[PDB]
Design a protein around this nucleic acid. Structure first.
Lengths: 150, 51, 59
RNA sequence: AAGCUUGAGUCUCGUAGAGGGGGGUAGAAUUCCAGGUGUAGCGGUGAAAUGCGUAGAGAUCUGGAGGAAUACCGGUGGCGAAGGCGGCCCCCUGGACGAAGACUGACGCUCAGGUGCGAAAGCGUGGGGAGCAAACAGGAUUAGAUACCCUGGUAGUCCACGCCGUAAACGAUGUCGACUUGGAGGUUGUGCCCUUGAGGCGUGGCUUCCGGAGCUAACGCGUUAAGUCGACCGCCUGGGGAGUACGGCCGCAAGGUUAAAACUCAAAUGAAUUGACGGGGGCCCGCACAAGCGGUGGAGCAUGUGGUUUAAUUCGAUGCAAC
RNA sequence: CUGCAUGGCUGUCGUCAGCUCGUGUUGUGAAAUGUUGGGUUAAGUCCCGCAACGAGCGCAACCCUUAUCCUUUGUUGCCAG
RNA sequence: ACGACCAGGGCUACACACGUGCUACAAUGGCGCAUACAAAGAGAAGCGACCUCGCGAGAGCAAGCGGACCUCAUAAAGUGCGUCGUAGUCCGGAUUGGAGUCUGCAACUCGACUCCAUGAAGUCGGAAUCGCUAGUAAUCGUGGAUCAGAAUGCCACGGUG
RNA sequence: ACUAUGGUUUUUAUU
């Protein structure tokens, strides 16, 4: 409406030289407790560099041009009917969303520590056969992957 | 209303703008306009209808 | 277009009638059959004949 | 009782057009007939089912059959007293109009009772029967559904000789004549011109909207008048009932014709202004949504209106604005 | 006892962009117009059409205050030397 | 007396369910130790330090300042160590019980506090459904008025974010 | 071209 503003000022991390990794301490993080997520920065990533890039400083950033969207579909309503309209992702949001759900299922399980549940999520980041795939496959799920509503 | 290259701008009078519908060109309605000017125009059009 | 492979069609001319939603994908699925579709004509009414048709009622 | 041409009427050569019949001239698909092509669903709905299907329902070709109906062109364009009239040609025919001359000589107007006309519907008899369709029977949805929606389907829809004259029969304006001001846009003759303009300028017949004056409560009417005036006819005199009731007529008949009152209200009626609102026609904002993310009511606590209740469970508050 | 008499408070639309009035204008008139159209805004905000041009309440002005700079006081507050 | 003193009932009675809040069903959890940093209020029958004793509450001795100085007062979450590998659990708290500690005219009834004994239901919830903006939301700490005593209501102040 | 179903509410002073 009349607000719209927008955007937030962000920097690369002072300790890691990454504009991506400073977002990762806001993921798998609760009640503002970034310190509990810093305990699993690079330390848990030695298990993940075994299958992604070389060294902890690129083991996620190589996948940056896959873990982000470029096209979606959006649900809109007219009278008694509902319609699924294809959309293109805007430049600031197309640059974003890389880690927003990439470790969603590490939250609660009862099996293994956080440093192990992190690696058991990032192992499916470029494969999409494991847990919570409905959170990352959704963008084509009213497009190419199902044509019955059209 | 729009005809030919216009587009790239500008060729004056601008009647593709402020449209929207209804009650346009009202400063060329009731008195003063027309007289014989549409007669000479349409006579030359009929002189150009031949064959 | 799979039910006609034994006829060996090469050049194909297309006619399109009526306003309905299936009027475009039917031309890409027909291109995907290996025919030259450089002629496509739209013949949608502009209504004629229909006896009259009868109409009446309002709007 | 004789004239007049000025109202009424007539003749030449010409003119536009869905005016009224009958005979000709053609096609479409749903349908029907036969032989081919050829198939798993078809139809409908927010969603379905009744129904119709592999025995080909559904779809379709080829040559034949049949019933309703006529796109285009067609125009804020015509015909006429209304109601009506729109594929196209012909024969027969009603109405209206032009150029220039020639005629009758007031032959005109209105009307009780008569006389003559009907869109659609209802009806007598004989044809008609594709697609729809009252009635009627089922499938929905509804605490109804008997209806809107869906599937079927008789009368009807059409033709013809007739019966009954109805209406929002509408511009709600009885019929006729006359005088009163302008504009834009259609429409058809004709004089003079081989139009050599794809027509100009005079001048008859028609014609849709605007609107200076006049009327009106306001809408409306407007030189095409509800304006200004005469000629002839019929119409009301307060509502509520009601062209209903009683009687004859005319029809096979529903009806049509002239047309109340006991009782009941001491009243109703017309126009559009400001609120109030919409399940309207439009525009603009809000976590009202979208998208993201974290909760609530089930268990066990803290606690209070209302309800139960001892001996009082004080009064007051029960919509957004109480607990 | 009861705001269904009142001093005086207080609920909600809502803190919405809206409501009136002088001197005119419109209509037979009660009244309406001015404030409905146009470009725009947080908004009757600002402008143009236009029978209006203006005024008061709401809004806004006005006034405070925050992010910068400048200045006065220093133990029991503070502690570069 | 529809005026109101004393003395008891009550308004914390329960033959109905419910609304708002709280806390669990736990493993970025819970318990027990180590380690690191505050803001704002309160103080004359005052705030009560420190020290000793009592499973402890608290009691006794008793400082300093009537408060920018003295006091209420080890801020908590965060970090690190130890641990269960998902069990009705080292989970969970209602009830049935004990023995002390404090105030007060008086606490059986209709209070608080402490240390201990029993330890249910509950495995994330009908038809469904609440909310939202930037030092904010989230979450974990602190203080205060009503008091002789006494809230999960009421009103306010920091960290991390 | 396109959603299909909302019945019921029993009253008063403009001091």
């Amino acid at each position: 409406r009349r607000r719209v503003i927008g955007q937030r000022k962000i920097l690369p991390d002072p300790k890691f030289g990454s504009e991506l990794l400073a977002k990762f301490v806001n993921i798998l993080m609760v009640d503002g407790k970034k310190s509990t997520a810093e305990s699993i920065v690079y330390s848990a990533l030695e298990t993940l560099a075994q299958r992604s890039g070389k060294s902890e400083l690129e083991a996620f950033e190589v996948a940056l041009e896959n873990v982000r969207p470029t096209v979606e579909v959006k649900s809109r309503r007219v009278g008694g009917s509902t319609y699924q309209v294809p959309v293109e992702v805007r430049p600031v949001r197309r640059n974003a969303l890389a880690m927003r759900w990439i470790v969603e299922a590490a939250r609660k399980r009862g099996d293994k520590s956080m440093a192990l549940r992190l690696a058991n999520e990032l192992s499916d980041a470029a494969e999409n056969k494991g847990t919570a795939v409905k959170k990352r496959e959704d963008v084509h799920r009213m497009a190419e992957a199902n044509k019955a509503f059209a | 209303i729009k005809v030919r290259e216009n587009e790239p701008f500008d060729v004056a009078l601008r009647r593709f703008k402020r449209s929207c519908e209804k009650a346009g060109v009202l400063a060329e309605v009731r008195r003063r306009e027309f007289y014989e000017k549409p007669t000479t125009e349409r006579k030359r059009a009929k002189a150009s209808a031949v064959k | 277009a799979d039910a006609v492979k034994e006829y060996g069609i090469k050049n194909l001319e297309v006619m399109v009638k009526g306003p309905g939603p299936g009027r475009e994908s039917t031309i890409r699925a027909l291109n995907a059959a290996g025919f030259r579709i450089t002629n496509i004509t739209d013949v949608t009414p502009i209504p004629h004949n229909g006896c009259r048709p009868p109409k009446k009622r309002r709007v």
